[PDB]
A paper describes a structure:
Among them, the heteromeric amino acid transporters (HATs) are unique members composed of two subunits, the light chain (SLC7) and the heavy chain (SLC3), linked by a conserved disulfide bridge. The light chain consists of 12 transmembrane helices and belongs to the amino acid‐polyamine‐organocation transporter (APC) superfamily. − amino‐acid transporter (SLC7A11, also named xCT) is a Na+‐independent electroneutral exchange system for cystine/glutamate.
As wild‐type xCT‐CD98hc displayed poor stability and could not be purified to homogeneity, we applied a consensus mutagenesis approach to xCT. The consensus mutated construct exhibited increased stability as compared to the wild‐type, and enabled the cryoelectron microscopy (cryo‐EM) map to be obtained at 6.2 Å resolution by single‐particle analysis. The N‐terminal transmembrane domain of CD98hc is adjacent to the TMD of xCTcons, consistent with the previous cryo‐EM model. TM1 and TM6 are apart from the substrate translocation pathway and create the cytoplasmic open cavity, similar to those in LAT1 structures, indicating that our structure captures an inward‐open state of xCTcons. The substrate‐binding pocket is also located at the same position as that of LAT1 and is empty, consistent with the absence of a substrate in our sample preparation. The ten TMs represent the common architecture of the APC superfamily consisting of three subdomains, hash, bundle, and arms. The cryo‐EM densities of the hash domain, characterized by the four helices arranged as a ‘hash’ character, are clearly resolved [Figure 5(a)]. The indistinct electron density suggests the structural flexibility of this domain. Notably, the current cryo‐EM density clearly showed the existence of a C‐terminal helix running parallel to the membrane, which was not visible in our previous structure of LAT1‐CD98hc, but detected in another study [Figure 3(a), 3(b)]. In the current case, xCTcons contains mutations of 20.2% residues over the whole protein, including the putative substrate binding pocket. Although wild‐type xCT shows Na+‐independent glutamate transport activity, xCTcons has lost this activity.
Residue numbers in the entry:
A (entry chain A): 163 to 631
B (entry chain B): 45 to 498
Write the structure that this text describes.
Amino acid sequence: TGLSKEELLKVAGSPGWVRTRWALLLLFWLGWLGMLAGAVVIIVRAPRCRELPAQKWWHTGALYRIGDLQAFQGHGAGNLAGLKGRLDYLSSLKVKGLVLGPIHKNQKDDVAQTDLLQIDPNFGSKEDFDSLLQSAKKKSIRVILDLTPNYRGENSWFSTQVDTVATKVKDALEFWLQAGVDGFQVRDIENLKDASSFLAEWQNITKGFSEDRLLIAGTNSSDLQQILSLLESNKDLLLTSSYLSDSGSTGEHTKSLVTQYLNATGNRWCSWSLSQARLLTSFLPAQLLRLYQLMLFTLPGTPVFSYGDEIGLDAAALPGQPMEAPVMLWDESSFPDIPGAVSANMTVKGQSEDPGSLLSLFRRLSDQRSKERSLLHGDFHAFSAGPGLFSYIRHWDQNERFLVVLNFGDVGLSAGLQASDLPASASLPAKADLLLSTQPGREEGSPLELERLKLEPHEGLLLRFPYAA
Amino acid sequence: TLLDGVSLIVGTIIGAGIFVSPKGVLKNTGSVGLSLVIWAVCGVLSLFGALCYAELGTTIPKSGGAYLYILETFGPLPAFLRGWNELLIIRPASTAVISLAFGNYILEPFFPTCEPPELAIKLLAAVGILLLTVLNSLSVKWSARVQDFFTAAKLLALLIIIVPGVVQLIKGQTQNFKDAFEGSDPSIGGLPLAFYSGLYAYVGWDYLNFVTEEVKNPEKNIPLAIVISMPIVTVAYVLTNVAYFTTLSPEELLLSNAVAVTFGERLLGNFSWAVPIFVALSCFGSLNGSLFAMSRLFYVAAREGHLPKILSMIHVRRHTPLPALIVSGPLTAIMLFLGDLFSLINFMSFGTWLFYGLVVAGLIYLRYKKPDLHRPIKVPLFIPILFLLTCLFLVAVSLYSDPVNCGIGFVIILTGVPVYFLFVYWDKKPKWFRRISEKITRHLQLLLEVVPEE
C-alpha cells in the first residue's frame, strides 16, 4: 500500500519518528541556512566589474571642422539651410559634432572692429543660427565655434594686441551661450599672449557656463613640450596640432609619435589631429590617408578632422579650389569649380556606394565606436609589431578586448605581431574578429587567426576579441 | 463575475519572462518593431488557446478536467503524456526561470557595472524556492496572504517599469527612438523562442479558463472575459515595450541582464527604490503559484489513483500537503541546476505548443466528427486551427533551432507514456513491494504527523 492508515499511525506515533522528524527539520532548515550563507559569501567573495570609466566629449566619437559655409556645403549658396541639410549627413556619419567656423564679424587685421560676439550677416543672423543650433541639438549634434577674431584677415590673431579680443572672447562666450554653442575652437596659440593662461581662464569661465562647453586648443606648433605646458595650464581642452603631422609618412615613427603624445598627455583628456586645422586629405594621399583616418580614430581620444576629410577632399589637387579655401565637393552637382573633372567617389554618393571610401570607412568606423564602449574608453596598449605595423591592444575599461593591426603603406607584410610583449591584462586571444579593414576584400567579420595573419597593402585591421586578461 | 474573472487571470498570470523576453525577442529577431509584435502575436495565440479551453469546458464540463477532458476524448494514457509531463517540464522549468530571473534581479544592484556570473542567481534562487515551500507548508492561507502581498506588489512591479515608461512617452522618447521599425520577410525568418516568449510571460491562464468556467458567471460570457483580457495583456506588453524603448534604449535591452535593474539605472533619484523588490515579490507570487499547481496536481494524480496518496496530505501541525511540496522541491532544484533560461524555455516551448495542440486538435476533430462542443461564443475552427498551425510550425523550427534540448524535451514528453504504464497498466507490482511501501510510507507519515487524502 502506498499510504498508511491514520489510525494505524496513531497506534504508534512514537518520538522515534516524531522527535526524529523534528531533528530532521532542524537539519533541514540548517542546511537551507548553510545554502543561504553560501549564496551570500559567494557574492561577497565575487569580484566586481570595473566601475565603466567614461568621459563625454573627451576621448570619444569624432568631430569635424567647418570654416566657410559655401565650402562646407559644396556651394554655391553657402546658406544655413544647406548646413541644416548637411546636419543629417553629419548624423549619417555618426559624428558627435562639428566646429562652426568663425561666423562672427572677423576683420581684415583689425582687433577693434572684430566682433567675437556679433555675427557676420554674410553667414546669417543669430536667430538663423539659433534655429540651426536647435536643429543640431535635435539631430544630436554638438556645436563648437572657432573663435579666430581675424579669420577675415591675414593673421588670425591680428599679429598685434589680443587682450582686446580676449575680453571679447569672454563676452562672446556669453553671446554665443545665448545662441546655444557648447564650446569654442581656438587656433594658432603661437600668436597669442600666453594662450595657456587665456585658455585656463576662458575654459573655467565656460566651465561655469557648463562643465562641458569645450574650447579647442589647436596649434601649428609641433613642440610637444610646449603643448605639454599648455596642458599644464589647461588640461581641459581638445587639442589639434602640427605635432601630430610630424608623423609624416613613417609608420614606426608615427607609432612612437602617438606614444609620445600619450606620454605628455598622461591621463588627460585625449584628442587627435595631424594638423591644427588642415585638410588631411590635402596633407597626404589615400594610401596612407585612409589608414590615418582609421588609425587616429582608433587612438585613445576624440579624433577631430576637418570637413572634406571624410570625402577625400584633396583641395590642393583640385583646380577651382586651394587647400586654404577648399570646397567640399560632396555632390555630383557640387562641382561648379571643377565641372566634371571629379567623380562620384569624391561625392558622398559614390562614396556611399564605395564601402572602402573614406566616407563609408569612417561611417562604419563611427558606427562601431557608437557601440564599442572600449573604443570609446579603454587602454589601447602599445602592442609592438614589425616595420609599418601599428598595433594596439584595446583594454575595454570593463571586459572586452580589441586589436589594431595596421599595415602602413602598400606593402604585402606578414602578421609581424609581437604577442610576447603583452602583460596578462593584454593577454589577447588569436581569433581576431575583423571589425574593419582598409583593403575591403579582407574577411570582415571573420575570427582571423592572428598567428597565421597575412597583411596586405594599405591594410588596417580593427579586430575584436573576448577579454583575455 | 466576468470582469472578476479577467482580474483573476491578468492580475495573476503575467510577466514570467518580462525581463527575459526583451532580449529574448530582440536577439532572436532584428527589426525591432516586429519583435514587439511578437508579444502581440503571443497574446493573440493565448486568445485562441483560451477560447478553445472555454469550448472544451462547455464540450465536456464533466470531471472538471482542466485537461482531463481531452483524455475523455483521447483516453487515460495521454494524461501523463499531457499533465505529468507538464509537471516534469513546464511547472518547474518556469519555476526555475522565474526564480533564476529573481536571482538575476537580486544580484545586479550589488554588481551594477556588468551582468554578474553564476552566483546567488542559482544558489539564492534555490534557497528562495525552499523558503517558499516552507511558506507554502505553513497553513496555506498564510501563503495565500503572502501571495496577496506578492500580487499587489506584482501589479506594482509592472507599474514601476511601465509608468516611468509613460513619463518618457510624455517626454517624447518614442520619437527619439522612432528609428525602431517594422517590415516584411518573404523568407519568413525569426526564432520560435522569441515567438514563445510573450506566451511564456503570460501562460497558465490556459487552465484558469476552467476556473472562470467554474466561477459564478454564464459560461457563454467567459469568452467575453477572454476576449477582454487578452488585448489587455497585449496592451500591457506594448506598455512594457514602451518603457523598454522610451526609458531604455534598444541597445540597453541587449545588455543581457535583468533589464528591470538597467531600467532602474535610467531613473532619477534613488532608483533602487524606483525599481524595488516588487520584481522579486512578483517572482515569488508566481513561484508559489507554480508550487501550488504542482502540489495540487500531485494531489490530483493520487485522486486519479496513479500516484500514492502519501505524496499529498497533511502534516496536521499546519494542515498542508507538505509531501506534495517536498516532491516539487527537487523537481525545481534540478531545473535550477540546469540554469540556462532559454533552454529551460525550449523545454517549455514544446510542451505548451504540443499540449495546447492536443486541446485544439481534439476540438477540431470533434467538430468534424462527434460535434456539439457547446461553443460559449460563435467562433469557427480557424481559432483552434490557426493556433495549432502556428504552434506546430514553431515546434518544427525550434527543433531545428536546438535539436539537443528540443530533442530531449520531446523525449521527456514521450516518456510520459511508459511512466503512465508504470503508474497504471503495469504487468505486476510485487506483494513485498506493497508491504514495504506501506511500511515505509507508514514511517514517513509517523515522521510527518498526518491525515491522509480522504
